[PDB]
């Protein structure tokens, strides 16, 4: 998570 988006889910 960084900026305004997620690329790695949990």
């Amino acid at each position: 998570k960084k900026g305004n988006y997620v690329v790695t889910d949990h």
Partner: antibody, heavy 119, light 106 residues
Framework: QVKLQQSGGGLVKPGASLKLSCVTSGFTFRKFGMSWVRQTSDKCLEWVASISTGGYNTYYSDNVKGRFTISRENAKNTLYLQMSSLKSEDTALYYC?????????????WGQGTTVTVS | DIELTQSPASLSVATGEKVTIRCMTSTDIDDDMNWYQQKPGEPPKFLISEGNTLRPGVPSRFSSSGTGTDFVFTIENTLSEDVGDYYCLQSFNVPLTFGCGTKLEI
């Protein structure tokens, strides 16, 4: 070694639908986010959509919201772009792309590009 | 929506000369600037990622710098094989946005 293999696309009339496929190899697909970005004849690049590792988070350009859907099937190492209600403005070379880090959609590997023409 | 504008739109250099290409953003991007090189009939190739760092395998003659909204890409000692279109990309926020390229000829 990382390979993004694209297929689908073609020439369709306005209002039509098209599903683009991107099959990946060479890495654990579920550990990476993926995106589609398109290149128009003016050679400008425009981000279309991004999807997180498991598919729980998706992001779309305002230009394709309500018409395109990005999805992935992790068991098949495949990324998809379902296009519907296509318009001439969507004519572009579409690229399959991998986010280079666990936190960024900045692209490292790119597929070879799939032509879609809407006319 | 962060806009990226590149400059010059194109340039022609002689072999062994330095090229300087710029990309400015409309707002801060936490140094998440990326640079690509694209040759005819190929996808863009990743040269520089976030934090102005050269990708492994890319020649050390390529560099980038800048912070805030003002970023630079340079090729010291340009070679004929560097002909192509160079693109910047911010990856700080979605929508991810690109400049529309600087065309390089030798």
């Amino acid at each position: 070694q990382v390979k993004l293999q694209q297929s689908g696309g073609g020439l369709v009339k306005p209002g039509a639908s098209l599903k683009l496929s991107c099959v990946t190899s060479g890495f654990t697909f579920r550990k990476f986010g993926m995106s589609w970005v398109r290149q128009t004849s003016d050679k400008c690049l425009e981000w279309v959509a991004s999807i997180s590792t498991g598919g729980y988070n998706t992001y779309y350009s305002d230009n394709v919201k309500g018409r395109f859907t990005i999805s992935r099937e992790n068991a098949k190492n495949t990324l998809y772009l379902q296009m519907s209600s296509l318009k001439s403005e969507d004519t572009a070379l579409y690229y399959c792309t991998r986010g280079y880090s666990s936190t960024s959609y900045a692209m490292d590997y790119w597929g070879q590009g799939t032509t879609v023409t809407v006319s | 929506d962060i806009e990226l504008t590149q400059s010059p739109a194109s340039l022609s250099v002689a072999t062994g000369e330095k090229v300087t290409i710029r990309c400015m953003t409309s707002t801060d991007i936490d140094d998440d600037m990326n640079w690509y090189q694209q040759k005819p009939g190929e996808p863009p190739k990743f040269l520089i990622s976030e934090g102005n760092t050269l990708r492994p395998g890319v020649p050390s003659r390529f560099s980038s710098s800048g912070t805030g909204t003002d970023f630079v890409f340079t090729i010291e000692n340009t070679l004929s094989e560097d002909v192509g279109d160079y693109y910047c990309l911010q990856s700080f926020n979605v929508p991810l946005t690109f400049g529309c390229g600087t065309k390089l000829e030798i």
